[PDB]
Amino acid sequence: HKDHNFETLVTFGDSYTDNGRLGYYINHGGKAPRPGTMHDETTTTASGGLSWAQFAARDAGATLMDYAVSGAVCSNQIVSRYFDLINRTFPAILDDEIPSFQADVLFKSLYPHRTAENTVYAVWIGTNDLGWGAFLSDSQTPGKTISDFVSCVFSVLDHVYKTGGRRFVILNTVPLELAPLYALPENGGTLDSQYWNTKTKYNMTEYGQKIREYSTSVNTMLENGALVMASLKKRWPKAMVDVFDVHSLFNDIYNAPTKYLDAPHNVNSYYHQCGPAGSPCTDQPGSLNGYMWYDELHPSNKTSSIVARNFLDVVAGKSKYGTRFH
Ligand SMILES: *[C@@H]1O[C@H](CO)[C@@H](O[C@@H]2O[C@H](CO)[C@@H](O)[C@H](O)[C@H]2NC(C)=O)[C@H](O)[C@H]1NC(C)=O
Ligand SMILES: *[C@@H]1O[C@H](CO)[C@@H](O)[C@H](O)[C@H]1NC(C)=O
């Protein structure tokens, strides 16, 4: 615990990170928690267990403030999706998560001693922005591009910086073409999915290559844009900005699953298999620790634990997956 040089982990993102906040919106009339209150934490997330942020905070002996909301995009002004269950859009980072955090930091009951040195701020967003019903189906605000998505991520860091945060980690986009949702059926991919219930009406090869181009392009722009902003444009004076190349880590797990997963070392299918309505559902035999993917879109709790251990290495300034900018 004392081997990790922070006391508080603040996370922004989507269902890869969420530890109960969409559940709050669902159960409280589609409204965020009141300022100075957090949602109830769950230990059963979209991973089938803990999210990476929970593994990381537990191993660091850190308090987790997890503002991630399942379904989120970076900015609803760029692209949004309607969640009928809450009678509004899925919450987004700029529109919903950041305003919550900005209100909460004024409460000592939540943030007893938040300093530039003792708090790490992480953002992991893009899975929904780049995917079906968003940029992949050209559903964004007309004229917006994936370059505007990258600009939004840096705007998240501006808002954190403005509150006095200085230690930033951007987690880049995963290889979404390897998620069974976007993979070809011949390689374990879904047919019609709860996340894309018309997938089989499309050239699945073309859409999977398009999401590879979008994700790799965003990853190039996140790393070199962060370098420009941090090192040339003076955008975050005296901040430390890490980029965690979780894209390479996902490829490493996918390509060598016997090094990372328990039997059956499955990377191309998914543990929890639902019909295209999202119901009914069957779990595969054997351990969840033997699956890269809890479902066709979400990394397993086992994959999430691997993300967490590498994240802590990135925060320590000693990781093959970390690039640090002062
Ligand atoms: C991921 O979550 C699964 C499911 O909860 C965990 O696996 C089980 O762990 C318990 C405690 O060891 C066992 O008794 C069960 O037999 C397992 N399966 C079920 C259905 O409960 C797994 O340990 C978690 N992995 C990580 C890395 O946290
Ligand atoms: C959405 O609106 C319906 C009907 O107006 C209502 O019954 C329901 O409680 C709303 N959902 C949320 C989470 O507010």
Ligand SMILES: *[C@@H]1O[C@H](CO)[C@@H](O)[C@H](O)[C@H]1NC(C)=O
């Ligand atoms: C589907 O997309 C792939 C990848 O671009 C292409 O090679 C193939 O010709 C396409 N098939 C059809 C029927 O359009």
Ligand SMILES: [K+]
């Ligand atoms: K610590």
